[PDB]
Write an enzyme that holds these catalytic residues in place. Structure first.
Site, short mmCIF file in Angstrom:
data_model
loop_
_atom_site.label_atom_id
_atom_site.label_comp_id
_atom_site.label_asym_id
_atom_site.label_seq_id
_atom_site.Cartn_x
_atom_site.Cartn_y
_atom_site.Cartn_z
N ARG A 135 -5.67 7.83 15.99
CA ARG A 135 -4.47 7.20 16.13
C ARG A 135 -4.40 6.79 17.74
O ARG A 135 -4.05 5.66 18.00
CB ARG A 135 -3.34 7.44 15.54
N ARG A 175 -4.70 8.87 11.27
CA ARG A 175 -5.44 7.28 11.06
C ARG A 175 -6.48 7.00 11.72
O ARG A 175 -6.53 7.27 13.02
CB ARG A 175 -4.36 6.30 12.08
N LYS A 194 2.10 4.56 1.55
CA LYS A 194 1.99 4.83 2.97
C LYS A 194 1.43 6.41 3.23
O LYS A 194 2.21 7.35 2.80
CB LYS A 194 3.13 4.88 3.67
N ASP A 234 0.77 -1.08 -0.02
CA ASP A 234 0.01 -0.03 0.07
C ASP A 234 0.83 1.22 0.08
O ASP A 234 1.81 1.28 0.59
CB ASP A 234 -0.64 -0.02 1.34
#
Ligand SMILES: Nc1ncnc2c1ncn2[C@@H]1O[C@H](COP(=O)(O)OP(=O)(O)OP(=O)(O)O)[C@@H](O)[C@H]1O
EC number: 6.5.1.1
Length: 577
Positions: free
Chosen positions: A267, A252, A247, A245
């Site tokens: 995150r 997140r 990055k 993938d």
């Protein structure tokens, strides 16, 4: 259960230094707690009332307003209350000292009850209710109780214990000893809510935790990636087989949906829903499904072009007052990359392919929520190609992910199932240059219609010439591969241009005009190329080993290219052996 014991806990925690004694202190406190209300106990002993993910307000009152609250609870004008605070330097202590100078004791229930109201009450007239509710508590409280009720509301419960500390102590208190850590940890990882786990441990027992599944609306501890700088080393860890993938650089986001309500966790498992109402809209409009837990990266996007913007821009968004203005200035795309739970089914135990197949099929095609850009790498070359395509787009690199029965969702742990490949390739064989396109080669075989190979050259200021350094074949996206023909044909010439010299004869000669950023491993000696002719070795020039096309340079003229002297200075500084 009486608050007295909790006040004793905090006071002794101030005195002790041994991790051993800490474990004993908590485990004791916990086991002598009330099974009914363990889920409150576990956060108070931290200095909280509830986990961060719920998104409720932090308990806080103005310092000027605590002084009145103490003054009321003690019958002492705020004037003289102010002074002890000046001299001492801790309002809790001041409160404690004023009580011990002068019929049912406080319960944990009434504390949690009260302190919730104080945290929860806002808007017109709440100031006065907070003050009166606290005063009530403090009045009911004994000396030591008061001191620590103050520190608690002030935020100044230092303490420095967290969820992990408590789990360890719950193993000791309820699992019957240390060996029980694994299970509790496992469960917590799938359901990051200490109180919920605590409640199960107490009611149903430690055995229950073994089969615990996630619960939509309560976060999963994120899975974390290892790091290696060698692409060959990476694919060997993956069995020569991986999903790779881009990055992404952003927030997140873990997105939950249950029937209708949507939850976005950060995150760090902060509740960030109310910061992203567009992502909420996007989720419900374009992701098919009754209830689920997925995760992806939220990424600032450029109003026009829609190029990705760095994380720092989302940060700026978070500080904008008009949310509707915030979104105009800082729109967003969501790049999804995993799926942990869909319609009452736990997906954490199923292969990455599986999770992704499902994940893809539920995204209605739109312009705002998309699947992470990815390939399936079957060799190092595939991984390298894509990685360089990534950095090429100003990317930080890639996330290399294992596939198969082992490729599960390792909630809350760092391991080798995902591995990041980052710019860190800096500490590896890499050197980056700007070269001029002097010609091209046609391909080979069944797809050899296209020009798929370019003769790159470097500038020689002394001779005002261009001298070849490398033939370049790889780094072009299929799209760029085609834009090439018309771009190159437009400047085709029947014979080599007088300012280019190359011992290599490409299929077509071209005008020295376009500049491309090339990256290679080292500079090596080559009889085929002319750059730095005879300077290091006779009858041979310098060359770029393993060149990869990266970019174009519209901001660089041909004379602005990397020089032959520069190629030499680069060569001359490589280790001798
Ligand atoms: N395609 C992707 N797949 C998985 N994770 C991704 C992807 N894109 C971004 N990330 C995530 O973004 C974060 C990477 O941030 P960074 O490279 O700075 O690591 P870090 O903050 O140093 O450590 P951590 O991995 O704990 O965040 C990780 O949480 C990583 O999982």
């Amino acid at each position: 259960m009486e608050f007295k014991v909790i006040a004793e806990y905090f006071d002794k925690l101030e005195k002790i230094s041994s991790r051993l004694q800490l474990t004993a202190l908590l485990a004791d406190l916990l086991s002598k707690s009330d099974k009914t209300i363990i889920d409150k106990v576990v956060y108070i002993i931290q200095g909280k009332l509830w986990p961060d993910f719920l998104g409720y307000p932090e308990l806080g009152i103005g310092e000027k307003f605590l002084i009145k609250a103490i003054s009321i609870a003690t019958n002492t004008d705020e004037n003289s209350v102010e002074n002890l605070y000046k001299t001492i330097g801790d309002l809790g202590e001041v409160a404690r000292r004023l009580k011990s100078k002068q019929k049912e004791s406080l319960t944990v229930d009434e504390v949690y009850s009260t302190l919730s109201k104080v945290a929860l009450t806002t808007g017109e007239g709440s100031r006065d209710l907070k003050i009166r509710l606290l005063a009530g508590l403090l009045k009911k409280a004994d000396p030591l109780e008061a001191k620590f009720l103050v520190r608690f509301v002030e935020g100044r419960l230092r303490v420095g214990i967290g969820d992990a500390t408590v789990l360890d102590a719950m193993a000791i208190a309820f699992g019957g000893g240390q060996s029980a850590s694994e299970i509790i940890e496992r469960a917590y990882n799938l359901r990051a809510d200490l109180g919920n786990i605590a409640k199960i441990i107490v009611e149903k027992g430690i055995e229950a935790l073994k089969t615990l599944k996630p619960q939509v609306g309560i976060p999963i501890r994120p899975m974390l990636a290892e790091r290696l700088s060698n692409p060959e080393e990476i694919l060997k860890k993956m069995g020569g087989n991986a999903i790779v993938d881009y990055k992404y650089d952003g927030e997140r986001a873990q997105i939950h949906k249950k029937e209708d309500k949507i939850f976005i966790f950060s995150r760090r498992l902060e509740n960030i829903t109310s910061q992203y109402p567009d992502v909420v809209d996007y989720v419900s409009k374009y992701i098919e499904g009754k209830e689920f837990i997925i995760e992806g990266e939220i990424v600032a996007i450029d109003p026009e072009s829609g190029e990705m913007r760095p994380f720092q821009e989302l940060m700026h968004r978070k500080r904008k007052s008009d949310i509707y203005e915030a979104i105009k200035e800082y729109p967003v795309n969501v790049f999804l990359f995993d799926l942990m739970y869909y319609e009452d089914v736990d997906y954490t135990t199923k292969p990455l392919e599986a999770r992704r197949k499902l994940l893809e099929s539920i995204v209605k095609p739109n312009d705002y929520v998309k699947i992470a850009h990815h390939i399936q790498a079957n060799n190092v070359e595939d991984l390298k190609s894509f990685f360089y395509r990534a950095i090429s787009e100003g990317g930080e690199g890639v996330m290399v992910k294992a596939i198969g029965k082992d490729a599960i969702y390792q909630a809350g742990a760092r391991g080798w199932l995902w591995i990041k490949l980052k710019r860190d390739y800096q500490s590896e064989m890499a050197d980056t240059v700007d070269l001029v396109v002097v010609g091209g080669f046609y391909g080979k075989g069944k797809r050899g219609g296209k020009i798929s190979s370019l003769l790159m050259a470097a500038y020689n200021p002394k001779t005002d010439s261009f001298e070849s350094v490398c033939k370049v074949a790889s780094g072009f996206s299929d799209e760029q591969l085609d834009e090439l023909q018309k771009k190159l044909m437009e400047i085709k010439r029947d014979v080599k241009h007088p300012r280019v010299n190359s011992k290599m004869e490409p299929d077509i000669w071209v005008e020295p005009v376009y500049v491309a950023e090339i990256i290679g491993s080292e500079i090596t000696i080559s009889p085929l190329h002319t750059c730095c002719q005879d300077v290091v070795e006779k009858d041979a020039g310098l060359s770029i080993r393993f060149p990869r096309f990266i970019r174009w340079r519209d901001d660089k003229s041909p004379e602005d290219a990397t020089t032959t002297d520069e190629i030499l200075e680069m060569y001359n500084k490589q280790p001798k052996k």
